[model samples]
Target: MEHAFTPLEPLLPTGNLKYCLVVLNQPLDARFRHLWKKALLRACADGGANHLYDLTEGERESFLPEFVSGDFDSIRPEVKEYYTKKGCDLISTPDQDHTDFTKCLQVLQRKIEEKELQVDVIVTLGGLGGRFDQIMASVNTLFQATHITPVPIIIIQKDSLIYLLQPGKHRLHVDTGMEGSWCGLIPVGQPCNQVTTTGLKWNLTNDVLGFGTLVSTSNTYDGSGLVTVETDHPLLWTMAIKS
Candidate 1:
């Protein structure tokens, strides 16, 4: 049986999986604090630590990350010193080919294996509020993770939640009613020749979806409480979080 996912559950204070939150460098206008409280392990990607440091301010001590890994180009000196002083692991990933988000995933994969950690899901704190290249990098990390690990990575942006749905049968539960009905299934990397879905206003009946093809956008839920998708290639699933 294919595993079902409550994609938006990470937004709540609690959930079924042991969530590992990765704080990226973004404004974090969402319910980031809520995820922080629920996370089993919290990691910062370079300047991401700076964002958390600034976000907490007076309560900075209470929100220490487990580790911060990156090229060390974007992280502030004061923020690094503070996290390191607070017992946070400062790791340097000096790979020029990979983005900080991808490097962070590599470190996280190693940590999970080394410590035998029980991190079922990865929920990133920020990604959408940035430059066009940075936004695409976030999406690239989602695809890049297929080679690193099987743990589902969910991106919590300002007013949206995004993730990649691998090829196969996927049943997503949107019954929480906490998120809006607007959702999208985008073929970002390549064209999907056979894509079928249910529980959406524009259900694809084994139709083709690509950049220049019938991409599913501006679609609303059918009030079915569940949305199922069967695709031949990886597909991007993005849903609007209730603002």
Candidate 2:
């Protein structure tokens, strides 16, 4: 007899949001093409538009982005023309100081302010792999945005999702049926002196985690309905579905 895999509960529905989906120039999976429909608005950072075009060829009509903005250094002329024909607002911000990802964030901020829209979240895709510098820059952008905006910003990698947590109580609600799921709280920026978690296989209490110290990795979930994490410093939460 074969055992069945449990399904993780969907994240809490916060209703419709004035959210922005930012895409970077990295290898993306076919599953991400549907995210454009989930987001209220969508924008691509420079060459990310090309990646988006490649990700959805026959499905391009179903995944039309709202705008494409960046320095235009990596954006192909043909790609720009394709989207422009579809009435996408292509704005070129020719500044080398900010990365294309950062440029997308700036555009999002302006749109939210102009329309007085409430941005509940900002989901970034294709900002994870390929180059080490690009990955680091994407993480830095996550930290910067969380510090400035109250809305939660998360990066969706091909195989995983990452989000930042401030120092306090956090409740991660997931479907009770999901099994074999994993969660880890990594101190990416600085060392976390003390941390504790509930509803996990290896629960922590006043654990010190740092660069060269103890850290939690590859920990499994223990048939709990939801998971809770408490910490004194910022940490990254990564979760994945079972393969």
Candidate 3:
């Protein structure tokens, strides 16, 4: 039997959906907050709700989140009431099996079912700079989302966005003259059998990379260019712009 896949557009504008992940235990930056506001959807993974509260006083009331669902462990009492007063739906699913990040995705899936929402891209924060276990779970979530959803999930950290590239053809579109943009094809799970890249300063073709091998790191783009990465298995591909 074939399963149905959700289209990745309604969540945000085509080619511009910024799905942000706000995790607990990290101080939210003003830069990221601005980006989150631009995102088609702003999701808080448990403690990330607290970071949202840290925004400026005036920003808080107007920064109404579309959805806030998690185990409700890290969410502060005041923040919960604040969002509640503003009519934001605060859902608590006390399942230890899944991290708050995973719960956010599950809630998204539910939304897709009930409301037919579209999620084109995902940008995760706070999940990277904290504990090791949480970081691992966040990375696992990225991989899982790619396997389950056809859309791209970009894990946004303090300085970059990370995603896994399956062995195939991909076209990246960016603003022209956007120089100093970097792409890294690193092996997160295991070594890639053979990999190739294009539209980069140092392009590669059919090169094997493994743990402790020739990993492509800090390769800058000549200009706003598309990078085509082909690998045997799902490998991590990260891109970063000036923060």
Candidate 4:
């Protein structure tokens, strides 16, 4: 069975897809409003509310999130008061063991189940180019999420989109001109002993990939608009988004 993926679709405004946008405690890309507009439910992870507040500027009413959850350490007093006044529910995740991003995901899952909302995908913002440990924690959460739910999760970075690819045949649609020419396949958690792919400048054929071994980084997309991948283990598939 071939699993199909349109990792970039949630960012676009064309499809009927229902996605939830989760904001982390990082800088928010102004261009991400397209996804925010179409999101089924919006949430923030603590200080993420501050980022959203900064991005909205005077138009705070137009970008209100449904909920904000985290340890309340990074979020500012005024920003929290603003969102709270706007009827945004504040969910407190006091667990110090889990990252705020991971706890935010759990909150989203609970929201979906409680409201019986139908969500096709989960798109998270501000997961790229931050502190070294935070960046790795974001990626690690992508892997941890698979164990909790079958829904596909994507991280929308400043100039890229990344998601997890489980073992099996997977087809990635890159026809959208919004994508850049570069793509990558990273083996995480475990090594991919037998991985194969097509529609890229450097296609792998039963190759080996691991931490210290070989990683398909900075691979160029062949402009085929469609890429296929088959792997025996989970891998992170990231594609460049054109500015």
Candidate 5:
């Protein structure tokens, strides 16, 4: 969680952690630029090439995606050529059926399995502010990547950050100085019979929350920035990143 604001090379209290950046079709703003540069590797899905290329400005060479993958159906030919000319690995899967997001994930797993790379977490950028269906697709990408590897996945949609809390105790350490205030804990994919948390203004204790019921929305930290969550089922952790 120390990486919630800083670089990745340092060892945390838990252990050494490495991160990988996954670019989706969402627009890449200036705030998330530090992430792409901090991660050990950079990956992109089809049009994500354009997204990254467009945001890169004069630093395109430094931000070149190491893995540019997905079905070529929606990719910008010029962007593809630009990355290709820069020696970025272009993986095309037009023959088989796989969303560009998942394809990049497959490549991520391949690199890990091949012992060529090691990543503890995967952060997918530009996962927000799309049509309802497109937003769901972003969620789908999280689930898809979940089953493919043991690594954790966090989706960055605009200024918000989203991740899953498995059926266990989760200790999230936040740096209040650089972290935003609004947060939410949502139960998706299934219902949760019991949920508990600490460090939030409206704390939950054995709360039965799900869609159409009570879900943590518009919540914030209560003085203490540390949070511990214990749940019987998986839940989503969401928060707005610092401005």
Candidate 6:
């Protein structure tokens, strides 16, 4: 029951893979705007509001986030006022028990709980874009969300689309036109005992993938536009997003 939709569907969304875009503290890029136009719902996490505000300098009122959530530790006063003035729901729970990103997801979770919202894939922007120190932490967030929530969490970077590939078979419909020539699969959390794949330049076969073992790196689709993956444990799947 695992199938990866076209890479173009996320970019030029047309009922293919419904996207729920969540922005982080980092800045949003061109791809962000593309998804923003068709996202099922939009949310900003903590200072993520600032990033959204920074981009909508002139279109401030025109672009109001459905929810602005966080500990309010990193958001500026002006950004808060602007959204507040525009009538955006500001959920400030300084519980200090959950990360800002998790809080944002919780907001969306509640919406879905009330039968007010539905999300196919949770697309995160600007999370894994910056800082080498928090790379594993960022990926960990994805894994946590995948288990915590019912939806799958995918990190959409400037040039990469990453997600936690649960221990199962994934039929990724690669758009050779939009997907770059490189990809990788690694056990960012733990070890995956057996991994297998097809439609890649170098496919795996019941191989053990771990940080210190046979991790699949620098892999590629053979221009056939379809890739399948199966593993024992959750592995981080990253493919180069087109330019």
Question: What TM-score do all the candidates reach, one by one?
Answer: 0.97, 0.85, 0.82, 0.96, 0.87, 0.92
- The lDDT per prediction is 0.88, 0.73, 0.66, 0.88, 0.76, 0.79
Segments in model 2 whose C-alpha atoms lie over 4 Å from true places: 1-19, 176-180
lDDT by residue for model 5 (8-57), tens: 12112333458888888878866566776577788998788888888887
Q: Give the TM-score of candidate 1.
A: 0.97
Superposing all C-alpha atoms, what RMSD in Å does each candidate have to the true structure? 1.2, 5.9, 4.7, 1.2, 3.9, 1.9
Ranking 1 against 3 by lDDT, winner: 1
List clashing residue pairs in candidate 5: none
Total clashing pairs in model 6: 0
Clashing pairs in 1: none
RMSD (CA, Å), candidate 2 to true, equals: 5.9
Q: For candidate 6, report its TM-score.
A: 0.92
TM-score comparison, 1 vs 6, better candidate: 1
lDDT of 1 by residue, 1-243 (tens): 565898887766545668799999987665887788878889999889888999899998789988999988789999888988988999998989999999999899998888888877998878887799999999999999989988999898878888899989899999886778599999999998899889999899899999987778889999989999998999999998888
How far is 225's C-alpha from truth in model 3 (Å)? 1.9
Error of 1 at 27 (Å): 1.2
Off by over 4 Å in 1: 14-16
Q: Kindly report which residue pairs in candidate 6 clash with one another.
A: none
Work out candidate 4's RMSD over C-alphas.
Answer: 1.2
Q: How displaced is residue 93 in candidate 4, in Å?
A: 0.4
Error of 3 at 51 (Å): 0.7
Tens digit per residue, CA lDDT, model 4, 1-243: 999878788756588998899998888786678888988999999889999999899899999999999988778889989998989999889999999889999888988999999998999998787798889999999988987666789998789888989889999998866787788999978999999999989999999989899998899988778999999999999989878
Q: lDDT of candidate 6?
A: 0.79
